[PDB]
């Protein structure tokens, strides 16, 4: 054939990949502490002899969007929201250290703090709270525990949440949705990120997802139009080859 | 070696195929933000010339080279994009989608026309082979 | 299941579940000692197609 069909076909398939990314972002429009994935087409030119006429296209996800989302006021002392450019630290699935923005902190029957089922990492390893005690979280992450039955004079600090500062260019979303330091950024900032004393959290507010609707809509419209365009070419090439095959006759 | 109209129509078919491939490349990456080295994807075009050999302005078409459009690249606003300049503007391709569609249709019909010319000449010379029966 | 009709179907189902939770909260306003529900969502495993 004329491999021009293999260019428009790639452009049509990567458009479906982009649509699958955008639809995934739209599905998580209500996920607490969600970071939308950025999608971008990139052109790769095929190198070789003769007129460099073929340039294929391949989707690309250049990190995520770090713009803070909405702050819903839920009058719950455990739901916290982070200052912009801030991250909470939890223990990842494989016993590693991961970063998140979901402040929906839950207390188990044994007293351990968890986020989405992952243990919360305190100044010194996971945080264990006295069993069945009221928890208040300060602006700088200090945790006060009140034991029921005892007077409010008993309120004393227990542990401090680890709050780190990381930009978009330094973190990469792992396969389980937890952000981790990129290789270059890890090599310069060390393996574990030191807690920043300047980070401020807000107790009683939960951060929503930063999925922008207007950009999503525009992206879907553009993707549909591009797919239809590539499909026109895929039809042009087909007919042209169908007719060109006649020269092989007589 | 290819003889006369066979050479002419073959050159025309090859150049129309190149034109359609360039149009398809422009139309596929009309929204690409970056290339492999960080530079934007600038729209490509073909340059047509007359084979001519030395003394015959009567030859097929030949694609001298693939030029890159020097028209200013579209600017979009994105200060968070790493590729943005000091002013926060990201360069985006200057592809005219309607122009690319029309170019694809034109390369298609010209390709078909030259195929028909080649077929007619082939039949004519096949019948020439039986001159005098 | 073209991977874009499944992803959006999942979002539609999630929004329907949230609406069901909201309707349950609103219907049980007059009950005694009722604690309101709140729906929490999490994105599933992201698939990696090609490494950076």
């Amino acid at each position: 054939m004329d491999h021009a069909i293999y260019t428009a076909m790639g452009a049509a398939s990567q458009t479906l990949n982009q649509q699958a990314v955008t639809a995934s972002n739209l599905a998580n429009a209500s996920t607490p502490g969600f970071r939308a994935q950025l999608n971008a087409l990139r052109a790769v030119p095929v190198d070789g002899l003769s007129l460099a006429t073929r340039t294929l296209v391949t989707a690309s996800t250049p990190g995520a969007d770090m713009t803070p989302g909405q702050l819903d006021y839920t009058s719950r002392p455990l739901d916290v929201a982070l200052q912009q450019d801030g991250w909470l630290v939890v223990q990842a699935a494989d016993g590693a250290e991961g970063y998140t923005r979901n402040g929906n902190i839950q207390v188990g029957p044994t007293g351990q703090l968890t986020i989405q089922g992952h243990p919360v990492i305190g100044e010194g390893g996971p945080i264990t709270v006295p069993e069945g005690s009221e928890i208040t979280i300060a602006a700088d992450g200090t945790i006060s525990a009140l034991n029921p039955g005892d007077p409010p004079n008993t309120v004393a600090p227990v542990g401090r949440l680890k709050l780190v500062k990381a930009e978009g260019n330094e973190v990469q979303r792992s396969d389980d949705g937890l952000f981790r330091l990129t290789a270059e950024a890890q090599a310069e900032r060390g393996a574990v990120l030191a807690a920043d004393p300047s980070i401020r959290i807000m107790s009683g507010v939960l951060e929503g997802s930063n999925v922008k609707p207007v950009e999503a809509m525009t992206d879907m419209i553009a993707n549909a139009r591009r797919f239809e365009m590539q499909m026109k070419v895929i039809t042009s090439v087909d007919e042209n080859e169908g007719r060109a095959n006649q020269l092989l006759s007589m | 070696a290819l003889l006369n109209i066979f050479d002419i129509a073959g050159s025309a078919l090859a150049a129309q195929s190149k034109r359609l491939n360039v149009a398809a490349s422009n139309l596929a990456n009309a929204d690409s933000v970056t290339g492999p080295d960080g530079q934007p994807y600038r729209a490509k075009q073909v340059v047509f010339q007359v084979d001519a050999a030395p003394g015959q302005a009567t030859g097929g078409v030949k694609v001298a080279s693939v030029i890159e459009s020097q028209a200013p690249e579209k600017l979009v606003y994105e200060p968070g994009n790493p590729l943005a300049d000091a002013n926060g503007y990201v360069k985006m391709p200057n592809v005219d989608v309607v122009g690319e569609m029309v170019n694809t249709m034109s390369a298609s019909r010209s390709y078909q026309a030259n195929i028909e010319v080649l077929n007619t000449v082939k039949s004519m010379m096949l019948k020439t082979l039986t001159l005098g029966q | 299941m073209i991977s874009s009709l499944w992803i959006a179907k999942t979002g539609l189902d999630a929004q329907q579940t949230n609406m069901d939770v909201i309707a349950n909260n609103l219907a049980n306003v007059s009950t005694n000692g009722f604690k309101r529900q709140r729906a929490v969502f999490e994105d599933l495993l992201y698939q990696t197609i090609r490494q950076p």
């Binding site: 790769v44 095929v46 190198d47 | 073959g10 090859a14 080295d37 | -």
Partner: peptide, 21 residues
């Protein structure tokens, strides 16, 4: 040489890098 002609040596390998080193 010109496209469509005959050469004495093979064309170089064809590769498309996603990201340049």
């Amino acid at each position: 040489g010109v496209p469509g002609a005959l050469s004495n040596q093979p064309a170089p390998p064809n590769e498309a890098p996603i990201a340049t080193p």
